Design a protein around this ligand. Structure first.
Ligand SMILES: CN1[C@@H]2CC[C@H]1C[C@@H](OC(=O)[C@H](CO)c1ccccc1)C2
Ligand SMILES: [O]
Ligand SMILES: [Sr+2]
Ligand SMILES: [Sr+2]
Ligand SMILES: [V+3]
Length: 324
């Protein structure tokens, strides 16, 4: 491959990463308290779990994956319409909510990935008119998907509230006001041993719901494991923001994506989290002399600038705000 895509030796994935047999798969149609308890345990112990029987229509999940795949099948002349000044946009602030194609990377290198990203909340004519024009059904399908994924995310955040002992709706405010949808395209890679689809990271936001049909997602436990694709499930990744607000009672998910030499892969990730104007701190309701705050309050915008630029460590974004 082009030297642009060659990862530093220490970041390259080993060829045989084992299945994560201990990744929790949580049935949301169990009894209410069982769901609260299983989500709580997964959040405390792993920070990454899957949800099934989650109430989001399977048909809609399939239609959304279809229109996302159709988008990435569009010819170059249509994709150029989402490349500002003739090249993909960068993940840097300000992160605008209009649809763009993005490039991402970090011994500088690029991730083997094309990403379409746009905001989803609140839905209005102005936002949806800034979404892709093609395929014709993208706007109708993804509007419905974005509303359903938000509804499911807020259900999971309220299960989390009950598990933590926070009032229901604790996160139904400025802490969840940004909803970015990223559709990721990983074309076949001639040298998977040298490249990464996505470098190891925490999601910087509050919570992310990821939809996948094919292997490539891996989680850091020391050891990397493979997250089994369940096409009708969502993968839930807890973000650095939730790790801070819970005072590290919950784990954040550290995960990466590897390339494939023979087939393409499309994933859909919905990133819910604070507005850039938000102040992030450990929830005061949970703090005590036995549970002192491990972070000072900080600007989400200030965090975001570091998080998007500094990949010296997974939690480089929050290192400046660590206390006690
Ligand atoms: C693989 N990369 C990682 C995660 C997704 C993707 C793009 C970038 O993350 C985001 O753009 C999200 C959007 O909410 C974000 C932006 C600023 C602060 C917190 C979170 C970095
Ligand atoms: O991500
Ligand atoms: Sr339903
Ligand atoms: Sr437009
Ligand atoms: V991620």
């Amino acid at each position: 491959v082009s030297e642009s895509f060659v990862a530093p030796l220490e970041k390259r994935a080993e060829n045989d990463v084992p299945l994560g047999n201990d990744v929790p798969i949580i049935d949301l149609q169990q009894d209410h308290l069982v769901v609260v308890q299983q989500i709580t345990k997964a959040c405390q112990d792993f920070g990454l779990f899957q949800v099934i029987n989650h109430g989001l229509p399977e048909k809609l999940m399939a239609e959304t994956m279809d229109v996302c795949k159709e988008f990435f099948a569009l010819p170059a002349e249509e994709k150029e319409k989402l490349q500002p000044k003739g090249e993909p946009a960068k993940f840097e602030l300000p992160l605008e909510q209009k649809a763009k194609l993005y490039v991402e990377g970090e011994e500088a290198f690029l991730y083997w990935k094309d990403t379409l990203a746009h905001g989803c909340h609140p839905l209005d004519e102005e936002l949806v008119n800034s979404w892709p024009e093609k395929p014709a059904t993208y706007r109708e399908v993804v509007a419905k998907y974005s509303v359903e994924v938000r509804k499911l995310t807020m259900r999971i955040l309220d299960y989390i509230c009950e598990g933590l002992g926070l009032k229901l709706g604790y996160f139904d405010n400025e802490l969840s006001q940004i909803q970015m949808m990223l559709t990721n395209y990983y074309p076949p890679c001639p040298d998977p041993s040298s490249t990464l689809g996505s470098g190891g990271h925490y999601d910087g936001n509050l919570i992310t719901l990821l939809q996948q049909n094919l292997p490539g997602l891996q989680q850091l436990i020391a050891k990397w494991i493979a997250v089994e694709p369940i096409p009708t499930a969502f993968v839930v990744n807890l973000g650095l923001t939730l790790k801070v607000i819970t005072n590290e009672k919950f784990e954040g998910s550290i995960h990466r994506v590897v390339t494939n030499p023979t087939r393409d892969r499309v994933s859909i990730a919905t990133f819910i989290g604070p507005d850039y104007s938000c102040t992030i701190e450990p929830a005061k309701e949970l703090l005590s002399q036995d549970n002192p705050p491990l972070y000072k309050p900080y600007s989400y915008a200030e965090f975001g600038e570091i998080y998007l630029s500094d990949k010296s460590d997974y939690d480089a974004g929050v290192k400046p705000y660590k206390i006690n």
